[PDB]
């Protein structure tokens, strides 16, 4: 279903609150994003890890140069956090992603996996900043 | 769902400070910050 898959969709507004929070390669790795390719067609890709690009770009108020190593079945390349769209996974895009996953051979994540992963972002959002992370963030 | 937003001292940049947290700005890092104007009906009489 597309509705259950949009629960872990990391929109463009949520990523602005974890630009310098540690454990970025643990809570983010697992969710899906609607990266814009470009005309209005979109392709859902899996978050394999985290990379850092040499180009610095501004995204509204803040500004980040980090990348996002994505993959859609087999075709993989470097992307940016500015091309991500806030739209939800449509039926056509959902079917396209399902077909790509079936063709690539990657087993579809189980429903319980998404159910237990969606809570990660929720528990990270309300995380108290009591440790020594503000110093690294400001640096 | 009000996280008690604040305004930094010199940066004048909004910050979300909750209870049991240090009083510092999201960037640079200072120790001074003020609050934002209330949302009440501030009505005066031009007398």
């Amino acid at each position: 279903l597309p509705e259950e898959l949009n629960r872990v969709r990391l929109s463009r507004h949520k990523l602005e609150r974890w630009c310098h929070m540690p454990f970025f390669a643990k809570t983010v790795t697992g969710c899906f994003v609607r990266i814009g390719i470009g005309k209005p067609v979109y392709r859902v890709a899996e978050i394999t890890g985290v990379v850092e690009t040499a180009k610095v770009y501004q995204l509204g108020g803040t500004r980040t140069n980090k990348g996002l190593q994505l993959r859609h079945g087999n075709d993989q390349r470097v992307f940016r956090l500015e091309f991500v769209s806030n739209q939800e996974f449509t039926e056509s895009e959902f079917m396209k992603w399902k077909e790509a996953m079936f063709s690539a051979g990657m087993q579809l994540p189980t429903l319980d996996e998404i159910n237990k992963k969606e809570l990660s972002i929720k528990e990270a959002l309300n995380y108290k900043f009591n440790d020594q992370d503000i110093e690294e963030i400001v640096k | 769902q009000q996280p008690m937003i604040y305004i930094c001292g010199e940066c004048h940049t909004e910050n979300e400070i909750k209870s049991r947290d240090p009083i510092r700005c999201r960037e640079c890092g200072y120790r001074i910050m003020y609050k934002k104007r209330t949302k009440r009906l501030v009505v005066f009489d031009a007398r």
């Binding site: 929109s11 463009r12 507004h13 949520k14 990266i35 814009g36 390719i37 470009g38 005309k39 509204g60 992307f79 940016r80 500015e82 091309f83 991500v84 769209s85 806030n86 739209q87 959002l125 | 769902q1 996280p3």
Partner: peptide, 17 residues
Amino acid sequence: TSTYGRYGSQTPMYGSG
């Protein structure tokens, strides 16, 4: 205050660049 999108703020594309 999770995501005040209200659509969005004109999202750029990859091939457009």
